[PDB]
Design a protein around this ligand. Structure first.
Ligand SMILES: *[C@@H]([C@H](C#N)C(=O)N1CCC[C@@H](n2nc(-c3ccc(Oc4ccccc4)cc3)c3c(N)ncnc32)C1)C(C)(C)C
Ligand SMILES: [Cl-]
Ligand SMILES: [Cl-]
Ligand SMILES: [Cl-]
Ligand code: NA
Ligand code: NA
Ligand code: NA
Ligand code: NA
Ligand code: NA
Ligand code: NA
Ligand code: NA
Ligand code: NA
Length: 268
């Protein structure tokens, strides 16, 4: 494979299985002997590989402390590999649900800052995540949360995941204009981040659990909004709620959100 991001699959070793969900199978292993890596094997026939491989360099050149660090890719062979740093604490959703952790709200707010910093960066690069959620944020050994799987939704082939009315579509993290009119923008990521904050302060509860995905869709349009989690103060709830303005252009930017979050942090 030729390219500044191309990794030699011969430099990879596969040591342990990690899971088989978001866009493909994931393996833990070593890169060049030294570095721990996670290797995501995109399920063969998963998406527009001509399209992904084409507009991959944009994704790969993204660099921020709160984005899971991409080391490279293997695109000559099939399946396509994506190699990242190993995140020892796994997906944020499982991390939140683990009852032995006993979080303080101080830690929850820090998680929200970590992700907001990452999303602020992506916003400044006009790069949409399109599927922000706790299930695809990652946590490292030091408890730092990082954003992952950013932008991959673009190349999904299955209309069950691509179409708003689809079976596997992330309805619960989507705003009205996406569910009705499939309008993805910076403001749809804003909406999703709000639901993520709700996931965090709810310690991993499913949004709108009492409703199915089709019922949730029906209720969002019509003005249903997530209630205030018990662990969320009024100021925290105000922040996440501001992400859910019906009119997209009335929602804040990630710069503003980060500023709000830092003010609350300074108030303890
Ligand atoms: C999550 C469970 C639990 N418990 C869980 O933590 N994981 C599900 C199985 C995969 C695990 N995993 N995936 C990666 C990973 C992700 C994405 C890429 O490639 C990218 C990165 C950025 C942008 C686009 C594409 C590579 C690798 C992991 C890493 N790096 N470390 C550790 N585990 C990783 C996560 C529920 C099923 C409970 C939600
Ligand atoms: Cl803890
Ligand atoms: Cl999408
Ligand atoms: Cl308050
Ligand atoms: Na391990
Ligand atoms: Na950084
Ligand atoms: Na603790
Ligand atoms: Na934290
Ligand atoms: Na999506
Ligand atoms: Na939008
Ligand atoms: Na409420
Ligand atoms: Na309060």
């Amino acid at each position: 494979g030729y390219g500044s991001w191309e990794i030699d699959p011969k430099d990879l070793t596969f040591l342990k299985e990690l899971g088989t969900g978001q866009f493909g199978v994931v393996k833990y292993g070593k890169w060049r002997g030294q570095y721990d890596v996670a290797i995501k094997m995109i399920k063969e026939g998963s998406m527009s590989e001509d399209e992904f491989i084409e507009e991959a360099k944009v994704m790969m050149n993204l660099s921020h402390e709160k984005l899971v660090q991409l080391y490279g890719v293997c695109t000559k062979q099939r399946p396509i590999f994506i190699i990242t740093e190993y995140m020892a604490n796994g997906c944020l959703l499982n991390y939140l649900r683990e009852m032995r952790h006993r979080f303080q709200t101080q830690q929850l707010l820090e998680m929200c800052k970590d992700v907001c910093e990452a999303m602020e960066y992506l916003e400044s690069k006009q790069f949409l995540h399109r599927d922000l959620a706790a299930r695809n944020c990652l946590v490292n050994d030091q408890g730092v949360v990082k954003v992952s799987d950013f932008g991959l939704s673009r190349y999904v082939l299955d209309d069950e995941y691509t179409s708003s009315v689809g079976s596997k579509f992330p309805v619960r993290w989507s705003p009205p204009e996406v569910l009705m009119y499939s309008k993805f923008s910076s403001k749809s990521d804003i909406w999703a981040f709000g639901v993520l904050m709700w996931e965090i302060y709810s310690l991993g509860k499913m949004p709108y659990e009492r409703f199915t995905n089709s019922e949730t869709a029906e209720h969002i349009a019509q003005g249903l909004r997530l209630y205030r989690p018990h662990l969320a103060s009024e100021k925290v709830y105000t922040i996440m709620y501001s992400c859910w303005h019906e009119k997209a252009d009335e929602r804040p930017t990630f710069k503003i959100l980060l500023s709000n979050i830092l003010d609350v942090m300074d108030e303890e």
